[PDB]
Amino acid sequence: RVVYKVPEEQPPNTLIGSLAADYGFPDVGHLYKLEVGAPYLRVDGKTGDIFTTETSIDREGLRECQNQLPGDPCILEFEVSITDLVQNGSPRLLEGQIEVQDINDNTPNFASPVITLAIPENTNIGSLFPIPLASDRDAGPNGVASYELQAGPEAQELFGLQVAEDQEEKQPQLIVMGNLDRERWDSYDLTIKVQDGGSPPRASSALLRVTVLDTNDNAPKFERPSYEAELSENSPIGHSVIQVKANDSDQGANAEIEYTFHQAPEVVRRLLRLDRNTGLITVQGPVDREDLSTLRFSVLAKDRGTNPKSARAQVVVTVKDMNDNAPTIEIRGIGLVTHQDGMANISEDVAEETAVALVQVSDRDEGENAAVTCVVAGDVPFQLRQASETGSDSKKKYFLQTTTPLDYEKVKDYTIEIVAVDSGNPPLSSTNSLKVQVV
Amino acid sequence: RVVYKVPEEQPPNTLIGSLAADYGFPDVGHLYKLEVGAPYLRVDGKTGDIFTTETSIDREGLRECQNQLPGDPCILEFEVSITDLVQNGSPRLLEGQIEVQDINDNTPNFASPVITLAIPENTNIGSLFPIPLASDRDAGPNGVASYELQAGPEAQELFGLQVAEDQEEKQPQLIVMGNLDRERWDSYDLTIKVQDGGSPPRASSALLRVTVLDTNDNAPKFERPSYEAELSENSPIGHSVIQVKANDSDQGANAEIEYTFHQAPEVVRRLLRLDRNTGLITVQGPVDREDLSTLRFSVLAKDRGTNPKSARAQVVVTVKDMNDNAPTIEIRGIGLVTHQDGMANISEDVAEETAVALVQVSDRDEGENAAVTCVVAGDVPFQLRQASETGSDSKKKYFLQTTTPLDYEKVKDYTIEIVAVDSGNPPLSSTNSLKVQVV
Ligand SMILES: *[C@@H]1O[C@H](CO)[C@@H](O[C@@H]2O[C@H](CO)[C@@H](O[C@@H]3O[C@H](CO)[C@@H](O)[C@H](O)[C@@H]3O)[C@H](O)[C@H]2NC(C)=O)[C@H](O)[C@H]1NC(C)=O
Ligand SMILES: *[C@@H]1O[C@H](CO)[C@@H](O[C@@H]2O[C@H](CO)[C@@H](O[C@@H]3O[C@H](CO)[C@@H](O)[C@H](O)[C@@H]3O)[C@H](O)[C@H]2NC(C)=O)[C@H](O)[C@H]1NC(C)=O
Ligand SMILES: *[C@@H]1O[C@H](CO)[C@@H](O)[C@H](O)[C@H]1NC(C)=O
Ligand SMILES: *[C@@H]1O[C@H](CO)[C@@H](O)[C@H](O)[C@H]1NC(C)=O
Ligand SMILES: [Ca+2]
Ligand SMILES: [Ca+2]
Ligand SMILES: [Ca+2]
Ligand SMILES: [Ca+2]
Ligand SMILES: [Ca+2]
Numbered sequence: 122r123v124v125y126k127v128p129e130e131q132p133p134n135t136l137i138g139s140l141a142a143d144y145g146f147p148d149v150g151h152l153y154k155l156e157v158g159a160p161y162l163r164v165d166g167k168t169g170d171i172f173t174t175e176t177s178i179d180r181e182g183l184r185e186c187q188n189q190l191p192g193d194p195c196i197l198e199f200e201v202s203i204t205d206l207v208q209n210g211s212p213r214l215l216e217g218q219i220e221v222q223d224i225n226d227n228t229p230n231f232a233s234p235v236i237t238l239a240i241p242e243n244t245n246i247g248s249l250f251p252i253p254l255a256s257d258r259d260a261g262p263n264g265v266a267s268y269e270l271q272a273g274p275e276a277q278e279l280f281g282l283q284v285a286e287d288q289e290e291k292q293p294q295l296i297v298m299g300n301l302d303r304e305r306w307d308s309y310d311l312t313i314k315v316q317d318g319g320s321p322p323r324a325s326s327a328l329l330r331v332t333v334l335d336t337n338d339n340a341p342k343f344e345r346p347s348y349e350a351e352l353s354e355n356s357p358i359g360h361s362v363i364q365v366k367a368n369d370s371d372q373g374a375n376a377e378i379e380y381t382f383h384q385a386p387e388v389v390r391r392l393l394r395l396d397r398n399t400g401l402i403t404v405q406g407p408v409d410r411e412d413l414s415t416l417r418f419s420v421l422a423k424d425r426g427t428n429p430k431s432a433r434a435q436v437v438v439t440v441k442d443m444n445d446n447a448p449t450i451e452i453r454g455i456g457l458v459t460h461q462d463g464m465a466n467i468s469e470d471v472a473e474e475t476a477v478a479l480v481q482v483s484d485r486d487e488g489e490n491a492a493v494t495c496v497v498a499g500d501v502p503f504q505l506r507q508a509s510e511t512g513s514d515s516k517k518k519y520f521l522q523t524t525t526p527l528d529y530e531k532v533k534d535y536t537i538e539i540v541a542v543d544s545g546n547p548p549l550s551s552t553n554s555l556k557v558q559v560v
Numbered sequence: 561r562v563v564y565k566v567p568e569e570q571p572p573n574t575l576i577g578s579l580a581a582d583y584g585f586p587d588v589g590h591l592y593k594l595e596v597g598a599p600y601l602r603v604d605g606k607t608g609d610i611f612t613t614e615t616s617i618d619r620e621g622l623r624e625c626q627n628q629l630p631g632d633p634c635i636l637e638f639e640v641s642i643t644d645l646v647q648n649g650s651p652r653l654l655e656g657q658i659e660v661q662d663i664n665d666n667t668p669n670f671a672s673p674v675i676t677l678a679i680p681e682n683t684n685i686g687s688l689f690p691i692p693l694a695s696d697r698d699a700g701p702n703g704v705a706s707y708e709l710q711a712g713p714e715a716q717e718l719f720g721l722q723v724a725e726d727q728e729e730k731q732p733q734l735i736v737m738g739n740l741d742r743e744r745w746d747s748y749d750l751t752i753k754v755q756d757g758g759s760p761p762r763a764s765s766a767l768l769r770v771t772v773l774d775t776n777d778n779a780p781k782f783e784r785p786s787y788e789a790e791l792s793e794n795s796p797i798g799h800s801v802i803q804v805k806a807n808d809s810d811q812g813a814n815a816e817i818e819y820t821f822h823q824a825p826e827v828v829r830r831l832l833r834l835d836r837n838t839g840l841i842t843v844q845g846p847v848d849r850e851d852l853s854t855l856r857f858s859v860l861a862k863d864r865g866t867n868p869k870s871a872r873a874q875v876v877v878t879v880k881d882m883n884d885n886a887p888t889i890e891i892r893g894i895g896l897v898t899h900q901d902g903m904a905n906i907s908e909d910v911a912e913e914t915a916v917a918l919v920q921v922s923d924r925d926e927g928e929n930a931a932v933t934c935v936v937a938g939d940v941p942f943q944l945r946q947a948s949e950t951g952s953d954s955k956k957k958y959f960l961q962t963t964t965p966l967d968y969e970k971v972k973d974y975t976i977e978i979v980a981v982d983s984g985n986p987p988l989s990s991t992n993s994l995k996v997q998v999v
């Protein structure tokens with residue numbers, strides 16, 4: 122009817138207590154038989170002495186106390202029946218109770234010998250991150266008592282050990298104490314150590330890995346800020362113009378880049394295609410220099426981050442000239458010489474070095490492809506003389522003057538064909554006529 | 561019945577000849593009427609004098625002599641009838657003939673005031689190239705007599721004027737006297753001048769253009785002889801590896817280049833694609849560094865000439881490592897400790913710092929992705945000690961030794977789980993077990 126406090130895991134045949142403190146007398150005509158708790162306990166039979174056995178009483182692994190709360194003790198009950206050896210025929214039944222005293226026979230440890238914590242790279246100082254707890258099958262001071270953060274020099278002054286001391290359970294926590302930057306270090310090796318509070322203390326150690334996640338904190342940047350390239354007029358579709366490239370220090374989709382035309386006039390969009398993945402600018406239209414000599418635009422690199430960061434680069438492509446236009450001869454009336462549908466009305470009186478018509482010839486190409494030379498065909502008395510001076514210009518003009526004295530009778534009409542050709546390869550030629558009619 | 565030689569284009573009423581040399585007498589009872597050649601000739605009627613008219617006799621443009629050969633003269637016949645004025649009733653019929661003497665009234669000229677000759681750029685010295693002839697409506701010395709080649713300084717000492725003097729006709733010819741090279745000059749401006757042989761002489765001048773055709777005499781050349789590039793393991797299909805570029809000084813199809821793998825092992829062909837037109841090498845397979853750390857090959861640029869000229873360029877791509885392989889834990893028997901299906905048979909006698917098994921852990925990645933750390937899980941009396949020294953190698957090995965004194969009774973069997981993790985981002989972990997059974 123009284124309780125007996127006993128340590129667990131005692132050695133066999135350890136005296137727990139004597140019922141001498143109870144009502145019976147020592148070895149006095151009473152048989153002490155045990156009826157309950159047979160596996161663990163054992164009685165002297167003659168005396169009221171209780172003893173242990175070779176089946177060690179284990180607080181941690183005994184049914185009676187498995188799902189228990191911290192405050193409650195581990196109890197196992199027993200029933201010792203005493204029968205008077207004087208043949209009196211009425212056994213007494215003494216109910217008894219054992220409170221198992223705990224002892225530090227279990228080590229605290231973590232579910233896994235390694236722990237992986239994931240911390241965004243620009244988390245503000247003071248941020249907390251929980252660590253998986255260590256469990257101790259023991260109770261009281263023999264349970265989890267204190268953690269400790271063992272880290273290297275670099276890791277020190279970045280991470281600290283703060284512990285929520287909530288009566289529920291020890292909550293360990295990693296406090297961020299410095300700025301992280303995945304583009305500098307993306308892995309840290311901490312070591313966490315746990316101990317229990319009974320002496321001598323038990324301990325465990327798990328490796329705490331801290332990897333840092335990527336934030337889109339870096340925008341893309343182009344190899345060089347601006348791009349130059351040349352491209353031949355009338356190039357074949359698919360011909361490669363230039364390749365633009367930018368790279369981003371981030372990781373994953375925060376560094377995956379896509380290229381797109383930024384503020385490109387329609388005229389350029391029609392003629393150029395920009396492969397968004399490879400950043401390759403190729404031709405997709407008729408590159409005609411005479412329409413546009415040089416095309417300018419800016420390309421945009423955008424990383425695939427949720428809040429994507431941009432980057433701009435200027436690019437200019439100069440179009441190299443091709444000889445795809447022939448010279449053009451125009452004939453018009455100089456001074457008082459009216460022209461109409463390619464005809465002229467002249468008298469045979471003013472006949473020497475007299476300008477009849479003014480011819481201007483011009484070629485839309487560049488340089489040697491517009492270096493035009495012009496002459497008069499056949500045998501007709503009309504010289505082409507240098508009209509005026511534009512320097513060394515590609516377009517020139519000539520006085521179409523007379524070289525002979527004319528007479529209405531012998532010569533009646535004319536048909537003059539002027540021929541022009543450019544110094545190209547292949548060369549291009551044009552011809553234009555003029556029927557000077559005399560009166 | 562006699563012939564009369566007369567120049568053409570005479571002035572009207574020019575005395576050609578008198579029939580006084582014939583049988584009749586001057587103005588003696590004979591009427592001289594003209595019956596043939598009315599348009600051009602005219603007779604005095606009283607005398608036997610023949611005269612011209614205002615319809616000028618033209619050798620060049622008269623029907624009687626159009627399709628004639630050089631030797632033949634221009635003839636026109638006439639019939640003068642004489643009737644005796646003494647009423648004798650039997651007219652005599654005098655047949656006569658005029659040979660038109662030629663005079664230099666026509667200028668030699670070319671069909672076109674400009675002539676375009678096409679000369680391959682590496683034609684050997686001495687090669688001949690015909691020039692269109694000049695035509696002269698005149699005949700004899702009044703016809704084409706001599707050409708002349710008027711050229712600039714640069715053109716001089718490259719081209720000469722040689723003339724086939726075949727009795728058929730003057731054949732002008734341009735003789736090549738120096739090496740041409742379209743990659744140096746692709747256009748030349750000669751001037752050809754023709755004259756006739758009657759004095760004063762007539763002349764014409766046509767511009768003779770000489771353009772040079774392209775021969776595939778230049779092979780392509782790469783921007784730089786060799787190419788380096790980096791490429792991340794397991795890159796997405798289509799990702800741009802590098803762009804190779806070569807250019808050729810020729811023109812047209814002799815400079816159009818196509819790029820193809822030259823002597824590339826199949827392993828590289830499976831993983832890389834080379835766009836033959838743009839020369840862009842992109843990814844088309846699983847880039848696995850552990851299979852090949854760096855891929856080397858050579859690319860070929862071939863111009864589209866009929867006899868195409870080649871160009872080779874070496875290229876090496878180093879594969880950047882990714883953490884796509886987890887560490888591997890192997891457990892094997894050290895010394896006299898036989899292992900079988902992950903078991904061991906040990907006695908509790910040798911118990912302190914006694915190697916039970918040998919563990920070797922290794923990661924196929926590189927650097928931090930193979931920087932492995934290894935530990936023992938849970939609470940079990942077995943320490944991992946540094947087995948031996950490979951320096952700072954990525955693969956390590958540990959003695960799996962005992963840390964406590966064992967006894968067959970209290971401890972009966974074990975299950976040890978070794979855990980390994982690499983210093984990657986993300987990190988990869990592996991685990992391997994070993995059931996050491998005691999006897
Ligand atoms: C994004 O692109 C830029 C520009 O290409 C990269 O920066 C460049 O990286 C190369 C490779 O290391 C550097 O080459 C270095 O050159 C110096 C001499 O200039 C030499 O001493 C080194 O041994 C090395 O060969 C280059 O200097 C550097 N340029 C700049 C302006 O930074 C950048 O690395 C790329 N991004 C990533 C994530 O790789
Ligand atoms: C085929 O590609 C080669 C290599 O890119 C071209 O040769 C290069 O042409 C550029 C453009 O003129 C040259 O730039 C020059 O640089 C010098 C200083 O190095 C500067 O003083 C000049 O004003 C000019 O900017 C470059 O030097 C030259 N490199 C070599 C090795 O020749 C070549 O032109 C291309 N083929 C064709 C037909 O264009
Ligand atoms: C020349 O005069 C005729 C006569 O009326 C006229 O029809 C023609 O248009 C004139 N041409 C020029 C160029 O003056
Ligand atoms: C241990 O001994 C048992 C007994 O036969 C045997 O079956 C087993 O294979 C042995 N294992 C080792 C690792 O020696
Ligand atoms: Ca216990
Ligand atoms: Ca404990
Ligand atoms: Ca305990
Ligand atoms: Ca950062
Ligand atoms: Ca980042």
Ligand SMILES: [Ca+2]
Pocket residue numbers: 337338339340341369370371375376424426430
């Ligand atoms: Ca980014």
Ligand SMILES: [Ca+2]
Pocket residue numbers: 354408409410411412445
């Ligand atoms: Ca054009």
Ligand SMILES: [Ca+2]
Pocket residue numbers: 354410411442443444445446485486487
């Ligand atoms: Ca052009």
Ligand SMILES: [Ca+2]
Pocket residue numbers: 444445446447448484485486490491543545549
């Ligand atoms: Ca032109």
Ligand SMILES: [Ca+2]
Pocket residue numbers: 528529530
């Ligand atoms: Ca007149």
Ligand SMILES: [Ca+2]
Pocket residue numbers: 568569617618619620621665
């Ligand atoms: Ca004539």
Ligand SMILES: [Ca+2]
Pocket residue numbers: 664665666667668696697698702703704756762
């Ligand atoms: Ca002539």
Ligand SMILES: [Ca+2]
Pocket residue numbers: 619620662663664665666697698699702
């Ligand atoms: Ca003549």
Ligand SMILES: [Ca+2]
Pocket residue numbers: 681740741742743744777
């Ligand atoms: Ca050449």
Ligand SMILES: [Ca+2]
Pocket residue numbers: 681742743774775776777778809810811814
């Ligand atoms: Ca060539």
Ligand SMILES: [Ca+2]
Pocket residue numbers: 776777778779780808809810814815863865869
């Ligand atoms: Ca070529």
Ligand SMILES: [Ca+2]
Pocket residue numbers: 793847848849850851884
């Ligand atoms: Ca791989």
Ligand SMILES: [Ca+2]
Pocket residue numbers: 793849850881882883884885924925926
């Ligand atoms: Ca790898």
Ligand SMILES: [Ca+2]
Pocket residue numbers: 883884885886887923924925929930982984988
């Ligand atoms: Ca790895």
Ligand SMILES: [Ca+2]
Pocket residue numbers: 967968969
């Ligand atoms: Ca023993």
